[PDB]
Each structure stands twice: as structure tokens, then as C-alpha cells.
Amino acid sequence: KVFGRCELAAAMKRHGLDNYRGYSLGNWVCAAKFESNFNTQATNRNTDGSTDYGILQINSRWWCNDGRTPGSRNLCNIPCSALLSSDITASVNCAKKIVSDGNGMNAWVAWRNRCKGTDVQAWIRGC
Ligand code: NA
């Protein structure tokens, strides 16, 4: 599913992401924009054997199982496919664990390069 901007904003807010671990709603929507372009079915292969999954591009090296990432972990205890659902529940609940494991949202490369230190509030502007 490809989310609309404020549609995703509302979905993320309902799942309790606004100000979660200190990060305003705009940050999460901005991350979603540059990670996946609001697309829940986004996937990206990395050179280390891992893959990024879902609207927040959560990685299989630590967070989910795809059965083909050597030496990896599965800390969110889910198949990576769960992160591709039109229901963002699995991606949010996993994202909450990720952001709570120190380093904050710096785990998301796209957020770090395109969102951090910018007018992220513009991404929930007019919702
Ligand atoms: Na949803």
C-alpha cells in the first residue's frame, strides 16, 4: 500500500509514534518519505546480505527474519514479510524497539541524511 502523506501521519499518530522516544510526528513521516516513498511494500537489498523492508525500511540483520541473512538476529520476533503489510502495526511496533535501542532515529539512514536538522514539521502540515 502506498500511503498518502497525512493518511500516514494519522496512521502513525494512532499507533502512538508522535513524540515517541522524543521524536515528533513529522520526523517519522519524513523518514517514511525518503526511506520508502510512503510504500509499505518497499524492499532494498544491501551488500552485506541483509534487506530493508517496509515503509520504514527495517533491516533483517537485526530486526526481522527473512531466512537468508547470514549471522543475523530477529529482535522484533517477526518475519520480514510482516513489515510489508498494508497494516503498519508490525512496522511501528518494531520501529519503537529500534528507536529505543539507543542512537535514536539515527538507525534510519534516509532520516539522517534528508530529515535530521530540517523542517520536518512540514510533513504533517495541513493534516
Ligand atoms: Na494502518
Author numbering: 1 to 127
Sentences from the paper on this structure:
HEWL, a small enzyme (14.3 kDa) is one of the most common model systems to study interactions with compounds (e.g., drugs, metals, etc.). HEWL has 17 positively charged (6 Lys, 11 Arg) and nine negatively charged residues (7 Asp, 2 Glu), thus leading to a net positive charge at pH below the isoelectric point (∼11). For this reason, we investigated the use of the sodium salt of hexatungstotellurate(VI) Na6[TeW6O24]⋅22 H2O (TEW) as an additive in crystallisation experiments with hen egg-white lysozyme (HEWL) as a protein model for X-ray structure analysis. The negatively charged TEW polyoxotungstate binds to sites with a positive electrostatic potential located between two (or more) symmetry-related protein chains.
The crystals diffracted to a resolution of 1.8 Å, and the structure was solved by a combination of molecular replacement (MR) and SAD, by exploiting the anomalous signals of the tungsten atoms. The HEWL–TEW complex crystallised in the P43212 space group as a “tetramer” (chains A–D), and is only the second HEWL PDB structure with this protein stoichiometry. Eight TEW molecules (TEW-1–8) were identified per asymmetric unit. The HEWL–TEW crystal shows an unusually long c-axis (261.84 Å; average for tetragonal HEWL, ∼40 Å), thus indicating a significant extension along the c-axis. PISA analysis (proteins, interfaces, structures and assemblies) revealed that there are no specific interactions that could lead to a stable quaternary assembly of HEWL in solution (hence “tetramer” is enclosed in quotation marks in this text; this is not a biological tetramer). “Tetramers” forming a pair are parallel to each other but differently orientated (displaced relative to each other by 90°) sharing one interface. This interface is the result of two monomers being crosslinked by four TEWs, with each monomer providing two POM clusters (TEW-1 and -2). Eight TEW molecules per HEWL “tetramer” are bound at positively charged pockets formed by at least two protein monomers, as shown by the coulombic surface of the protein “tetramer”. In general, all TEW molecules are bound to positively charged basic (Arg and Lys) or polar/hydrophilic residues (Asn and Gln), with distances from 2.0 to 4.1 Å (strong hydrogen bonds to weak electrostatic interactions). Importantly, the TEWs interact mainly with side chains in flexible regions, including β-bridges (single-pair β-strand hydrogen bond formation), bends (regions with high curvature) and turns between secondary structural elements. Thus, POM did not alter the physiological conformation of the protein, thus further validating its use in protein crystallisation.
